[PDB]
Amino acid sequence: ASGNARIGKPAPDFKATAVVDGAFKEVKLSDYKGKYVVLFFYPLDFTFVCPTEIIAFSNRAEDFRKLGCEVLGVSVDSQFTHLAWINTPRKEGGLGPLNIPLLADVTRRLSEDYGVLKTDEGIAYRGLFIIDGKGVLRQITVNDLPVGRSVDEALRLVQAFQYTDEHGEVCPAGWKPGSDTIKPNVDDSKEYFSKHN
Amino acid sequence: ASGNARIGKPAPDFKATAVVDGAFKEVKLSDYKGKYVVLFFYPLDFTFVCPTEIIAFSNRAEDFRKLGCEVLGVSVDSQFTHLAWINTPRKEGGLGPLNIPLLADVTRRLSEDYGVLKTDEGIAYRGLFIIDGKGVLRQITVNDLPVGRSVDEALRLVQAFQYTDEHGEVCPAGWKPGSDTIKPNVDDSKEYFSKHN
Amino acid sequence: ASGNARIGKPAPDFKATAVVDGAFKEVKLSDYKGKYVVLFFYPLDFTFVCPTEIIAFSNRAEDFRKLGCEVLGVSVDSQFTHLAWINTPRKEGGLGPLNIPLLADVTRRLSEDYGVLKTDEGIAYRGLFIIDGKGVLRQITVNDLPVGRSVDEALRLVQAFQYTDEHGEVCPAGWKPGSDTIKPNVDDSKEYFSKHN
Amino acid sequence: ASGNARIGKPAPDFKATAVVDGAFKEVKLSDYKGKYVVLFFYPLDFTFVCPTEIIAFSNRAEDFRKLGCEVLGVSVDSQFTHLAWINTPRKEGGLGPLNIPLLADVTRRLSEDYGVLKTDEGIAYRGLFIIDGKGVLRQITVNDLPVGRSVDEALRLVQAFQYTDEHGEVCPAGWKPGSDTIKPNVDDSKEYFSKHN
Amino acid sequence: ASGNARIGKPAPDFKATAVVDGAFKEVKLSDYKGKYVVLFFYPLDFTFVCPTEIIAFSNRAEDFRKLGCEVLGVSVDSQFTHLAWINTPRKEGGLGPLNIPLLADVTRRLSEDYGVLKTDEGIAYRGLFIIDGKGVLRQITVNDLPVGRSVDEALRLVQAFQYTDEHGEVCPAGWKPGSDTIKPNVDDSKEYFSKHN
Amino acid sequence: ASGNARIGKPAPDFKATAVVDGAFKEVKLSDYKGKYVVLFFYPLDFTFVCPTEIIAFSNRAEDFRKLGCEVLGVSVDSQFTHLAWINTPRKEGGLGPLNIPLLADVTRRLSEDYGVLKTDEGIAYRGLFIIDGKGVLRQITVNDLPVGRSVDEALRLVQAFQYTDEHGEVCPAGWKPGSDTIKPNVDDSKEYFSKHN
Amino acid sequence: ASGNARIGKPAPDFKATAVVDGAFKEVKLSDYKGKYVVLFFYPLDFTFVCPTEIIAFSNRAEDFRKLGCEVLGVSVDSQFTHLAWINTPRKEGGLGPLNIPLLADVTRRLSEDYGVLKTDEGIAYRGLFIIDGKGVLRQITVNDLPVGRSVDEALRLVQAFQYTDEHGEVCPAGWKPGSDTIKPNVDDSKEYFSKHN
Amino acid sequence: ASGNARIGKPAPDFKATAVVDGAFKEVKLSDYKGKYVVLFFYPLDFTFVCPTEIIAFSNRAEDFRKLGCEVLGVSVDSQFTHLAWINTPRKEGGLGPLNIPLLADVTRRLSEDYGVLKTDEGIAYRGLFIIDGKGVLRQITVNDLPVGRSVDEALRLVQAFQYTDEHGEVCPAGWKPGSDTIKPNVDDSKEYFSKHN
Amino acid sequence: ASGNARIGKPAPDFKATAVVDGAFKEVKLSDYKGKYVVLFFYPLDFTFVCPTEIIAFSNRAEDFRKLGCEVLGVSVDSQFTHLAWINTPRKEGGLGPLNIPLLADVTRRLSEDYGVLKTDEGIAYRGLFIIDGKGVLRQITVNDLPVGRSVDEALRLVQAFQYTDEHGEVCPAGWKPGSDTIKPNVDDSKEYFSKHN
Amino acid sequence: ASGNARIGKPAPDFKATAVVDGAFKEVKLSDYKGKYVVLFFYPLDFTFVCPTEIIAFSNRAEDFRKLGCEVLGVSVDSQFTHLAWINTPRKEGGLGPLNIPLLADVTRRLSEDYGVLKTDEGIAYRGLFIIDGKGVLRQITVNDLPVGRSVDEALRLVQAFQYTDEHGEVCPAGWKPGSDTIKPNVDDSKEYFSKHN
């Protein structure tokens, strides 16, 4: 309804200062050519749902990396606030040491380009975007602010997109690694349907 | 973020002819005021991922209705095609009997209003929208065509939004029934952060 | 009143996926250079006048091909629905095997370009167009939805346009093969008028 | 599809001077409320296909009148020229006495409103329009100039539209008085399909 | 007030099918380079003032031709109507054989370009235009419909414009061949003024 | 056809200071309601054709007034120049005493509104305009500068419009008082055509 | 407030037919390169203040020409009216023989370009313009109609501009040949201020 | 001709702070109803021509006041700068004591409304304006910067406009008190013309 | 000079969530009617110059409040970040307990309305604004990012504006309490200039 | 809020005649490349705050020059007014001899480009601008009219900007030469924060 995030088209380009390994660094979409990217927006540092999503993705960061997928978090806060929050203990609502980059969208350019800026408050909705290794947007998930996202579902979707890319079959509702897939033509699809009904 | 579909605003109204219990009936969003609605778009009748999503949501329709949530499926196909697909056995790639309405968006107004029309093919992307009982859009999920959605995650999200609606706490990453929630102010949030770190 | 179909001008170009001998194939107007084309739109797969028209044209298709004329059927339904309709027995309202292509106009571009889209429903009127081997539109017929067309009249019109094309005489009202024609100049036309009156 | 001519909408209003029983009289669409109207345009008085069409319709005008349908011809020529042509013997290419009104469209307003003006010559294409007793346009037929229309088919179409008007069944391809019709709903149409296949 | 007819400027180009000696022939303004042209428009074939004007000019056509002036008549009627009118005896309101071309302005371009189209009826006013041998418009005469023009006055004007062209003197009011002219400078003009007052 | 001068429509309004019987007086078109008006424009006081037309109209002014027609002359020169020219003897190229008003169009509004301003010189062409007693323009005559008009033809046209106004017959080519007219309907016109051919 | 006459900028270019020594001649601003020009407009030939201004300037024309300044008079009247007025005795309000050109601004271009047209009457105000030998406008004087200008003041201004041009001193209020001037710098102007106060 | 300054129309209103007998005071055009006003712009305080003009007008202010005319000087300088210049001795380039108001136009609205702003320096040209007791602009004088105006000519024009106001005669070139005027009609003007030639 | 910030006019209104004594509260400009406000923007929480300014104003807060002036800081960071910074010890670059409100401009509306947003970074320049008890902006100070402001000067300016508000005298360069002021009129100002020079 | 003065971008260029050492001279921004420039606007010569500001900056001009910074004053007054004010004793409210250029902004271009024109009075606000050797605007200070600026603070700011320019550390609140600066990065800034708290 706003922005440039269109499924099946080049994901909107982005460039931002990020906190990586406790220091500041530039991060560009072009750095991830050939890898999947999970780009997740959250509204505000030092709030409530947001730490739980950042910590859960960070904790699972290596599961995504094994599949060749990089997880990036972003909010409109600055890298200085991000680092203050990292340097805050998890028992006190902080992030502690982090295993994924935290990008600063201080100009709001990323949130606008991805169509997730809550304009009346100046903060990003809980938008998550899956981008494949060719740079194409494959998936858009946007939650209203009071409800966190699911790292498990994000991982399922990355796995499913990579599987369909690699084999040319399509993934049924609720597919997980090991589940049956469907050959996408009228005749061959009957192998799946005869078995599952 | 979807055409006129904006989180936190009234979801775009819709009116459509639907197949309901093997017969044709008009269905309107206003019919569901006071109830949650899961509205899911799918690209094409008589294809491959789409039946698996329609059947999965149909099979679990009652779980959503036990929560006061109605599930509605939508594609650009006509009601006559829908019915022909309902009348095709599941083993042959049909839908068989269905326990959810199947809306016909032959004018494409619904797909355009929700921002999910893949214009170059004239079909809807795999867009799912969660609308609360006040008619406000709370959640947007959109998949590229080869990967089906998760009925479980749809259910988790509806459970989560209903839980935050009633209790005024917020749901952390991965929340499900039985999970702790956070009191969204700085002092009261500490109860959650100390317990879980 | 809408669209680009103008008698005496190049017919609106079209390209569409079609069902041809039970398989999917791209069909485009340029495939027919040097042949007459009868392009007929119908509103909806799995309805009632439409199969009778499609079957009547399919059954006479060779009568057109002997004249070097190709008959093409088109609706806004997808090729998957077309195929399910072809695989439905005629006794049950299906098409059965067909001897003409059935084009899928899912984007509605063909129906818009030919001015036959019934916008408030998103379906094509019963528009039939006759295009000569030069690619020029020669005839427009458009019926409201409840009244089928006549295959006999379409064939007569093709015959008449081919005859005037080759001989430079003009075809009176009601002309069929074997009927007298008029030499369209003031002096030579008296041969017809004085004979037939 | 023609200028303001849209199937299923009110037919473009018209008012013209006509020759009626050898005298001048104004003719307007509103005169024919409660009756069907067949309005046929032709390009030029004192030419070749046109007299054969006007004569054929005039000869058969009572076959339309018995059905409550009025036939009206129209070209851009003036009523004075129409009267001259009526006063010319048919053996010399004239019309002789006529049993239908011949309208003068010297301003070209009718031709423009019905979308049949051939602009590079300033004459009407051979457009025929069937309007019902409620003034709604039901049918459009336009031929290129060298090929005359069929009075049989016009009559069949008038008969078809009146039959579906009165009985709410639909007319298959090639329908003629006495042929079977289809009840346009999924269950009741099976009567037709099983009997005819 | 409308059109492009401007005294002292190149007359608007025209190209028309005409009846010439009972046959059809293209006539273009450029055909007349080096000759004067009297182009007279009239409203309608088979009316009342029009034939008397056409016949009056046709009867006097050789008086203009002897001067190197060609007379051309034009109305919005077609060449087929013109010929029919020529083939009608003068006693019955016809033209009989004509000694001038009669141009068909069926597209109304000539009438619009000379600014004489009566828009509410689609017919030309009684406009007459004198064009010199360089193709420059010299004179505009336009009458309302009920009053015919004067061939005598049109001849006088052609003679006067040729006289001034050749001799560079100017023609007083009512000048006719044989009358005194004025040398158009202050001193030499007194030759005229002293004599006639 | 001149600026705002449209035959059949109210003549463009005008008001001007004029010389009338050697004094300055306001003249307005509304002064002549109920009377015919001949309005003639000429380019320049103290030139060559102009005095001959002014004197000729002045000399005949009573022939026009006996018909209830008022003759008005106009140029772009001021009333002081008009008066000086009236005070110049005709033997010297002056006007001498005048029997018609001479309007001063110093703003050029009259010439512009009547479409006769020769813009590259700022002077009016020899435009003459016949306006009826309803204020409706009936006739437009415009000569290039070197050739004077005919007062006899102006009088004939006034006589003819008044004759057709009062009797409802139309005036053939070259009609003068005493000449036959035509009854402008098909049947009654035969009286003239058979008498005169 | 209108036009293009701007002090310190090139005077608006002009070209006009003029009466010069009793004959017609083209006069253009570029003819006066290197000379001063006093260009004076007046409203109307054959009026009252204007002859007195024209005669005054003509009587003094040699005083200006001794200084290398050319005087030009202009009104909207034509050259024929100018000559008629020159040929009128001064005792009767005429100009008699003149020693300055009288330009005819019949298109009003000069008056519009110099911003002196009184639009409601179509005549020039009493505007006088001093142009130096480089073509730059130095002075603008405009009087309402009832009050004539002063030739002595125009002469004083020409002398003053020429003196400042040549000496680069500035001319105090009321300066005339022989009067002191001011050296326009702070230090050197004290020579003047101490002497005269 | 001056921005909004149009001869014969109400002079542009103005309101300004002014130095008046060495104190600050608001001065507005409406203060002078029923009195003539000579409003003169000059470019800059503490320059060279300007003080001679200001002083010359001040010295003659009672001369203008005995005629009911108020003189006002104006520049873009502030009232504080005006007062410093008044408090500067005349021998030093100052104004000494003054008998006329000195208006400050530091917004440049007066200079822009009177069309005398030299835009590339931000200072007024030497524009003088004569406004009559009814508020109507009668006279515009503008000098380029190096040449002062003439107080005697300003007084002459004030006298002349008051004389024509009072008596309804017009003032010939060079008119002063004691000179004859002209009765502005053709017949009474002969008294002046015969007497002075 | 800042976005909507114009000296002498009502300061741009603002409303924002702020940290006030360790808790969140809405702060609006209307809260301070009848009091002076020093509104200072800074670019980023958890950076370097910014904490020194915030602490310096916090430490001096009561000096301002004693004069009836309220000091307000603002940055684009959220109130959660502000509170985390306040809860950070000054020795680590935190703010510690603060005596002044810290406003959150997460929408950037305040920074835009005050014209201080550094667009390419999305952060506010070091803009300081002094607003009087009537809500009128009296002072704008904007620093580039590397250079902090002076609290001593802000206080001096508040005192200076308050003094001039009460006593209607004006404050020289470098005025501090106890310093002489100037009576702003020509005569009474000499008291000051003679004393101090 | 108006004009082009943007911190961190090239300062608006300027050109102007100034008084320098008692004489007139052109000054332009490009003259000061490689030097800091303090450009201060003031509203009016011969007023009250302004001289005290100009004298204070002139008295301390060598303090700035030693630092490679040039102080320039500017008001809308002309250079002749400036020189007169400079020639007025300071005891009289004059400037006396001056050690800084005073620029004349008579066209108001400088005040508009720097956005400090008080448009309703046409005079500059007390805007001061600090520009670095690269021409980049570094500081903006604008006071309402009744309060003078502080030369001490202007100098402190020049000193601060020069210091950060050369060393790349940032200047805390109130920094004066010899005060500690901050290294602008997270870790190195700790040296300052631990020392000073």
Side-chain angles (χ1 to χ4, degrees), chain H residues 113-126:
Chain H
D113 284 349
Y114 278 82
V116 290
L117 198 68
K118 179 178 204 288
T119 315
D120 69 349
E121 293 189 80
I123 57 181
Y125 278 114
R126 302 195 190 277

Side-chain angles (χ1 to χ4, degrees), chain J residues 3-190:
Chain J
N4 298 320
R6 318 219 88 219
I7 303 260
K9 292 196 177 312
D13 177 78
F14 59 81
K15 255 209 291 165
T17 297
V19 188
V20 183
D21 301 328
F24 299 153
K25 175 196 180 66
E26 176 166 317
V27 177
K28 53 198 194 189
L29 178 53
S30 55
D31 300 339
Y32 300 94
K33 294 256 65 178
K35 298 258 278 194
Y36 264 70
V37 174
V38 173
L39 175 70
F40 73 97
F41 292 77
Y42 63 95
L44 293 164
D45 289 15
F46 292 106
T47 62
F48 314 108
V49 175
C50 308
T52 79
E53 288 184 320
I54 295 159
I55 293 157
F57 268 115
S58 171
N59 282 351
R60 301 202 56 184
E62 212 60 44
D63 290 353
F64 291 85
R65 264 150 199 162
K66 293 160 186 293
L67 300 188
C69 175
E70 289 296 337
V71 181
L72 308 170
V74 48
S75 84
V76 295
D77 303 277
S78 83
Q79 71 273 18
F80 301 95
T81 294
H82 287 347
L83 189 62
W85 202 18
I86 285 164
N87 286 328
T88 296
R90 291 184 178 182
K91 244 156 291 210
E92 307 270 40
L95 301 177
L98 226 50
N99 301 340
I100 49 152
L102 223 57
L103 275 63
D105 185 27
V106 187
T107 72
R108 284 70 40 64
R109 182 53 143 69
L110 280 78
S111 306
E112 294 170 322
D113 287 356
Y114 277 85
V116 297
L117 190 68
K118 190 173 183 289
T119 70
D120 72 330
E121 289 190 75
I123 64 194
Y125 275 108
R126 300 187 194 284
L128 176 154
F129 298 92
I130 300 189
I131 301 163
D132 73 22
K134 280 288 181 171
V136 173
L137 183 59
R138 305 310 295 282
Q139 214 276 333
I140 295 170
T141 299
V142 193
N143 283 17
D144 192 10
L145 295 184
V147 175
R149 289 151 288 191
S150 148
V151 173
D152 288 4
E153 172 62 0
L155 177 73
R156 190 194 70 87
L157 283 170
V158 173
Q159 293 168 329
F161 277 106
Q162 294 193 327
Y163 195 97
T164 63
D165 279 6
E166 52 181 272
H167 300 158
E169 292 187 27
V170 296
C171 288
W175 175 98
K176 286 160 150 177
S179 307
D180 277 7
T181 54
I182 308 178
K183 224 161 266 181
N185 62 72
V186 175
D187 291 340
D188 293 348
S189 57
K190 304 298 182 181

Side-chain angles (χ1 to χ4, degrees), chain C residues 64-186:
Chain C
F64 288 85
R65 285 189 182 120
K66 292 184 108 301
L67 303 173
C69 180
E70 295 289 350
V71 178
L72 303 172
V74 52
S75 82
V76 298
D77 301 278
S78 86
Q79 68 273 26
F80 300 98
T81 298
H82 285 344
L83 187 59
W85 202 17
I86 287 164
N87 293 331
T88 300
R90 295 177 180 184
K91 284 181 187 286
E92 296 165 40
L95 295 181
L98 287 177
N99 205 18
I100 54 169
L102 229 48
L103 282 55
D105 183 30
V106 187
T107 67
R108 273 68 174 166
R109 166 77 152 275
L110 272 72
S111 301
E112 297 168 352
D113 285 350
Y114 274 84
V116 293
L117 193 62
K118 182 186 192 283
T119 71
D120 71 340
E121 287 186 89
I123 62 182
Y125 279 107
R126 303 194 188 283
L128 173 150
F129 304 80
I130 300 173
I131 305 167
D132 73 16
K134 300 172 177 121
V136 176
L137 182 61
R138 307 309 292 289
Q139 207 279 331
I140 296 163
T141 305
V142 191
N143 284 17
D144 196 11
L145 298 186
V147 174
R149 290 157 284 191
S150 164
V151 176
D152 277 353
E153 176 68 1
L155 180 70
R156 185 194 79 85
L157 287 166
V158 174
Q159 292 168 324
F161 282 117
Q162 292 184 328
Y163 190 93
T164 59
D165 282 355
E166 168 167 9
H167 293 103
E169 306 199 13
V170 296
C171 295
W175 177 94
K176 298 184 192 180
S179 293
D180 272 353
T181 49
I182 315 174
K183 310 199 184 111
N185 65 69
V186 172

